[PDB]
Amino acid sequence: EELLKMWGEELTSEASVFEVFVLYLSGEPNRNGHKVTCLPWNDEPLAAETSLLKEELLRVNRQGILTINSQPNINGKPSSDPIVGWGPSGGYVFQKAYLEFFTSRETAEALLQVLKKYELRVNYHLVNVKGENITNAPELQPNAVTWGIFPGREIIQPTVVDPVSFMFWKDEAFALWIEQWGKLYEEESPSRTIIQYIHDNYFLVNLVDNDFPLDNCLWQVVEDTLELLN
Amino acid sequence: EELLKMWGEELTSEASVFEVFVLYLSGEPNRNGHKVTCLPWNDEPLAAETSLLKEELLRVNRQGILTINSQPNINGKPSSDPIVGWGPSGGYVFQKAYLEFFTSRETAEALLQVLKKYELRVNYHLVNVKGENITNAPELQPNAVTWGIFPGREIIQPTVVDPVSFMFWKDEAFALWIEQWGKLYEEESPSRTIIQYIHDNYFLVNLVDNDFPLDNCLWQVVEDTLELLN
Ligand SMILES: Nc1ncnc2c1ncn2[C@@H]1O[C@H](CSCC[C@H](N)C(=O)O)[C@@H](O)[C@H]1O
Ligand SMILES: Nc1ncnc2c1ncn2[C@@H]1O[C@H](CSCC[C@H](N)C(=O)O)[C@@H](O)[C@H]1O
């Protein structure tokens, strides 16, 4: 009853879903006065590194690019930074920019068309519930996205985007629609209709911008998809 | 006969050894008109990254800090750079500054005294033929000194300074004096005296500055040792 109170008692349209993600990312309550304190993929409030890319995420989600995971790029910041720092003291820490999101088939086709402009810079991975796995991943090999350099030590790379492990995550990612939000609504409801439509027709998408020394391209990539579509 | 022609037919003093290293590092011939084209540890001309730190090495060796291996610090330069670049195209490549050298016991004690000022920033390792291994190495663990970040890929760290492997290199490093320069001179020669003295009384020393984003400290560390000594 508390989940169904924050995610809306009944969805009017896709817009309702778009708002549930925008109200998770902003601090604002819905029209009923309740904050979206979690989503099926998160169960938590955001980690503090998202403070670096909040407005951007607001803008992206307001369009229907439904982000479920993210990362700022970090260019060798002090390992003591309370926002991004980790590991032993006196080192440096690094990140690639990363974005994980669901999309409509229409927006997925517009994104595949725009990713031709960014092919070598951005690793991408689109998939849907029937398969149709599309990725530019080198030989289906991991991509490092977080690492740290520490005094007297080897490099530590704690975090990766593996195209093989993503295909096990896919099975959670799409089933968390029906199993935790669909089964929350009535069987025959237009709400269930909406959620079953999103369970079937949407693409899960992952992007990684490999140029961590530069400004993040992923926001311009999505602006370029909304240009092409609009 | 060709080695003994370039390393000098007979050493007057330690100064003679100091000059053989300075004439390896500069392009200049000795007083006899012959270039030092190699040393016992190298068998080759320098790699092009030394162009970035030549004058510095000239200055260091002119004092008796006999460098046998070195590296500039590199802060995420294009992986396509003909000087420093390596691996797949479109990535970034990184280095810590590194210096490997022999020293007199007097200069080794002056360096141990000055390394107290740089303790956390500079990894150091001194050793001599009897043992007397001194290092600040974390739990006797490797230190990364070269690495690269490439699109779609994990980090590659091709090059390390391992405090355990250094103790196998030690046995070459000191024996290459007697086995390739000492046995080049006569048995009873003052030249053999000189080389046996350097085979026994000198310390092999390795330093690594871990702050690759900053200007290299190692040159000021050696200036600080020549201040203390002088
Ligand atoms: N709905 C959502 N949209 C965008 N980002 C989200 C999100 N829910 C969680 N996140 C973010 O996803 C990230 C998980 S942590 C990612 C790993 C970490 N940056 C590393 O350094 O290895 C956090 O920043 C979290 O705030
Ligand atoms: N006598 C000497 N003094 C100082 N440096 C030397 C030297 N003889 C060789 N070198 C240097 O030692 C280095 C060996 S290559 C070191 C590894 C490489 N920089 C990496 O990126 O992993 C070369 O730069 C070479 O020019």
Author numbering:
A (entry chain B), B (entry chain A): 415 to 644
Paper text:
5,10-methylenetetrahydrofolate reductase (MTHFR) commits folate-derived one-carbon units to generate the methyl-donor s-adenosyl-l-methionine (SAM). The catalytic domain (CD), composed of a TIM-barrel fold conserved across all species, binds the cofactor flavin adenine dinucleotide (FAD), the electron donor nicotinamide adenine dinucleotide phosphate (NADPH) and the substrate CH2-THF, such that physiologically the forward activity leading to CH3-THF formation takes place. This CD is appended to a structurally unique regulatory domain (RD) via an extended inter-domain linker.
Our structures therefore reveal that the RD binding pocket undergoes major remodelling to accommodate either one SAH molecule (at site 1) in the dis-inhibited conformer (MTHFRFLSAH/MTHFRtruncSAH structures), or two SAM molecules (at sites 1 and 2) in the inhibited conformer (MTHFRFLSAM structure). More specifically, in the presence of SAH, LS1 loops into the RD pocket to contact the homocysteine and sulphonium moieties, thereby adopting a position that ‘seals off’ site 2.
